[PDB]
Amino acid sequence: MKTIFSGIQPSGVITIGNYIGALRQFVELQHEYNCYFCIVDQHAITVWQDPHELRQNIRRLAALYLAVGIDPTQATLFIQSEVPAHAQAAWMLQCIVYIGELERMTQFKEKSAGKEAVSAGLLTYPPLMAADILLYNTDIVPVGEDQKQHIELTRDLAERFNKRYGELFTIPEARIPKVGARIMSLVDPTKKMSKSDPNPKAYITLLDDAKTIEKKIKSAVTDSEGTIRYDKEAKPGISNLLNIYSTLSGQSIEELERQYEGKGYGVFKADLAQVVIETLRPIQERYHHWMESEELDRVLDEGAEKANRVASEMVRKMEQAMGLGRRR
Amino acid sequence: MKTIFSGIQPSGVITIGNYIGALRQFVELQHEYNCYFCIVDQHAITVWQDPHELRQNIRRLAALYLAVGIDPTQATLFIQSEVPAHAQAAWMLQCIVYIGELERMTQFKEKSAGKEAVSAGLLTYPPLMAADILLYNTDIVPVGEDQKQHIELTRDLAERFNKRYGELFTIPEARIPKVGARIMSLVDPTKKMSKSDPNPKAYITLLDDAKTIEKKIKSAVTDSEGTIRYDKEAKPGISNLLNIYSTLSGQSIEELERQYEGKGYGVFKADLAQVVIETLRPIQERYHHWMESEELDRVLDEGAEKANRVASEMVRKMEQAMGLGRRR
Numbered sequence: 322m323k324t325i326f327s328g329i330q331p332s333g334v335i336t337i338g339n340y341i342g343a344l345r346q347f348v349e350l351q352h353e354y355n356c357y358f359c360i361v362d363q364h365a366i367t368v369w370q371d372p373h374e375l376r377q378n379i380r381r382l383a384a385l386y387l388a389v390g391i392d393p394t395q396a397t398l399f400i401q402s403e404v405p406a407h408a409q410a411a412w413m414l415q416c417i418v419y420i421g422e423l424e425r426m427t428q429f430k431e432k433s434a435g436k437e438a439v440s441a442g443l444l445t446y447p448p449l450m451a452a453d454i455l456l457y458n459t460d461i462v463p464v465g466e467d468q469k470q471h472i473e474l475t476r477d478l479a480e481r482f483n484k485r486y487g488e489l490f491t492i493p494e495a496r497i498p499k500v501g502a503r504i505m506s507l508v509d510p511t512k513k514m515s516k517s518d519p520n521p522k523a524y525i526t527l528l529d530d531a532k533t534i535e536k537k538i539k540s541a542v543t544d545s546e547g548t549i550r551y552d553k554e555a556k557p558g559i560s561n562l563l564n565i566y567s568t569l570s571g572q573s574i575e576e577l578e579r580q581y582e583g584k585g586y587g588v589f590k591a592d593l594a595q596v597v598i599e600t601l602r603p604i605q606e607r608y609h610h611w612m613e614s615e616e617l618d619r620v621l622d623e624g625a626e627k628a629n630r631v632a633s634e635m636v637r638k639m640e641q642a643m644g645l646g647r648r649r
Numbered sequence: 650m651k652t653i654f655s656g657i658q659p660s661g662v663i664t665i666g667n668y669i670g671a672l673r674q675f676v677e678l679q680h681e682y683n684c685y686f687c688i689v690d691q692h693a694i695t696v697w698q699d700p701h702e703l704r705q706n707i708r709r710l711a712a713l714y715l716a717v718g719i720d721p722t723q724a725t726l727f728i729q730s731e732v733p734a735h736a737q738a739a740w741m742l743q744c745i746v747y748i749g750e751l752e753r754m755t756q757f758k759e760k761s762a763g764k765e766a767v768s769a770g771l772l773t774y775p776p777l778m779a780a781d782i783l784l785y786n787t788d789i790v791p792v793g794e795d796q797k798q799h800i801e802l803t804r805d806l807a808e809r810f811n812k813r814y815g816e817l818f819t820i821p822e823a824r825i826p827k828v829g830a831r832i833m834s835l836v837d838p839t840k841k842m843s844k845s846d847p848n849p850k851a852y853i854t855l856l857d858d859a860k861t862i863e864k865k866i867k868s869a870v871t872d873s874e875g876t877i878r879y880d881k882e883a884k885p886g887i888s889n890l891l892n893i894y895s896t897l898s899g900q901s902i903e904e905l906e907r908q909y910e911g912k913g914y915g916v917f918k919a920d921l922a923q924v925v926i927e928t929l930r931p932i933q934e935r936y937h938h939w940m941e942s943e944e945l946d947r948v949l950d951e952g953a954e955k956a957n958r959v960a961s962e963m964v965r966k967m968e969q970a971m972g973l974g975r976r977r
């Protein structure tokens with residue numbers, strides 16, 4: 322079968338946007354592809370991470386991957402840093418990416434937007450992500466609309482390497498969901514929901530308690546119409562709430578518009594909170610199971626073992642193409 | 650004893666500048682320090698390297714290190730790429746260096762001087778070099794005047810890591826020779842002699858034949874005075890030739906000025922060529938011995954083995970400080 326790779330940064334607790342845009346689809350994709358799902362801790366340090374928080378976040382992410390249903394025997398779950406090949410191939414890839422291609426990345430300009438001093442890692446985020454994917458001869462990359470431009474660069478980089486040194490890389494393809502590819506901030510409907518937003522009201526983590534989810538849905542930005550109908554341009558907050566409601570409940574935006582005819586934001590929000598709470602319920606239960614056992618560490622050990630075998634061999638192939646080191 | 654680290658890029662065949670400014674001193678330093686001498690192949694790919702040339706250059710550099718007298722039992726001779734920790738610590742260090750500190754590096758601006766598209770590796774050269782040094786708890790760094798600014802950044806980076814996460818790194822110190830720290834191009838006395846200069850007349854490689862050394866010394870830029878006397882500002886080419894003559898022969902600039910009183914550039918250059926040829930003679934002989942045996946590969950295997958033990962443990966310490974991966 323074809324191969325899949327996809328990473329999530331342990332830069333905070335994953336949100337419903339992360340879930341809706343990517344994680345949710347991993348669970349189904351694992352049975353039809355050879356999958357590598359990564360906890361990208363090296364990507365997470367491109368900005369300040371408290372060391373204790375990062376360690377904890379790394380373990381929580383792994384538990385949540387398994388809690389949503391990733392089966393360690395059907396897919397390879399691992400931590401980026403535990404596979405030296407990602408840093409190796411990242412170095413090689415940054416000697417072929419042009420500085421201008423990095424500065425033109427919208428994620429770079431956005432995250433670097435209005436900062437005096439910024440880490441080089443923020444800028445060199447792309448070559449590492451390109452290595453993450455390219456290392457496993459990945460065919461499909463399940464994301465995550467905001468990740469489209471990175472995958473496009475990654476393709477340019479694999480092509481440049483292939484034509485410069487010889488055919489080595491499979492050109493990967495992004496797989497972005499038709500629905501939920503871009504869940505918006507609850508607090509600023511013009512920005513996507515980010516797990517690292519400085520405002521906790523912007524997102525709902527997969528670990529949020531009922532009380533917390535009710536508050537967050539209640540504080541969500543809407544408008545003064547009091548009319549539940551989808552209109553991304555005119556009613557951004559309400560349209561986003563409808564999207565969340567629609568993908569989580571399985572009802573169409575249109576069905577929800579009818580069901581809420583004659584209502585009623587208070588009631589619409591109260592209902593949506595319960596829908597999110599009910600979705601997160603079985604997930605949180607299994608998360609607690611994984612968090613309290615050493616089984617989590619066995620899954621990760623075995624996952625890094627398999628990833629190392631595949632990746633270090635690609636690295637060897639890459640060094641042989643570039644002329645690095647010695648003949649092996 | 651204290652520890653030493655120093656690298657040389659296998660980006661061409663080392664020159665007499667490389668020799669005079671660094672390699673020559675490694676031979677004496679090895680008996681008084683714990684030394685790690687590196688063949689930095691990952692630094693070499695920051696610009697285009699022909700894969701066959703790079704492979705060959707890597708093996709030639711190792712043979713020349715040993716040919717000048719580095720004793721594999723007194724020092725650790727290794728190839729950068731063969732120790733994954735350099736790429737690992739390089740990634741971590743680039744998440745702490747600021748983009749502005751990289752753009753202000755004069756080597757960056759020089760090598761990137763007048764180029765439309767440039768590799769990110771050119772820009773991120775410093776974090777990798779900082780990792781190279783920091784990995785081994787290096788106290789002294791023998792270079793290489795042009796390398797002073799990199800070592801200064803490396804110190805800022807170790808200090809930033811130490812104060813941000815906890816004391817881990819030894820603050821390294823540059824050790825630049827009083828004489829020969831900056832051998833100039835034979836063709837452009839305002840630029841340093843570089844092994845990768847697009848003009849082969851600029852430098853004399855340690856592998857150049859007698860005929861080639863005579864031509865290069867003969868074509869060396871001088872002036873219209875016909876007076877052999879040292880004057881860096883007024884007589885840059887002649888002063889550089891005097892410097893080369895002085896460090897290689899063991900005579901003072903002043904002794905040479907007297908000995909050449911009443912002469913005589915033709916004769917001065919003819920004499921200097923023979924001095925270089927006579928110096929390179931015993932070196933080239935041993936170089937051919939190493940090139941034709943598998944002993945060269947045993948030295949490198951053992952050198953990477955020792956370097957891996959030390960470096961991967963520093964990497965583990967670094968990840969533990971930043972919170973990467975899992976507790977080990």
Ligand SMILES: Nc1ncnc2c1ncn2[C@@H]1O[C@H](COP(=O)(O)OP(=O)(O)OP(=O)(O)O)[C@@H](O)[C@H]1O
Pocket residue numbers: 328329330331332333336338339340341342343463464465466467468501502503504505513514515516517518
């Ligand atoms: N708002 C969103 N809607 C749908 N998918 C999203 C959203 N935000 C992120 N994703 C997807 O989630 C995955 C994990 O990405 P990532 O770890 O960068 O999350 P993040 O929330 O954006 O975190 P951070 O704020 O630290 O950068 C990717 O496939 C990504 O495109």
Ligand SMILES: Nc1ncnc2c1ncn2[C@@H]1O[C@H](COP(=O)(O)OP(=O)(O)OP(=O)(O)O)[C@@H](O)[C@H]1O
Pocket residue numbers: 656657658659660661664666667668669670671791792793794795796829830831832833841842843844845846
């Ligand atoms: N002209 C020179 N005079 C004295 N020392 C030098 C000179 N050029 C380089 N060195 C020293 O040689 C060592 C190896 O450096 P490096 O491998 O960068 O050589 P390079 O000739 O400058 O190569 P390249 O042109 O590929 O960058 C360092 O210690 C460096 O400072």
Ligand SMILES: [Mg+2]
Pocket residue numbers: none
């Ligand atoms: Mg992100």
Ligand SMILES: [Mg+2]
Pocket residue numbers: none
């Ligand atoms: Mg150099």
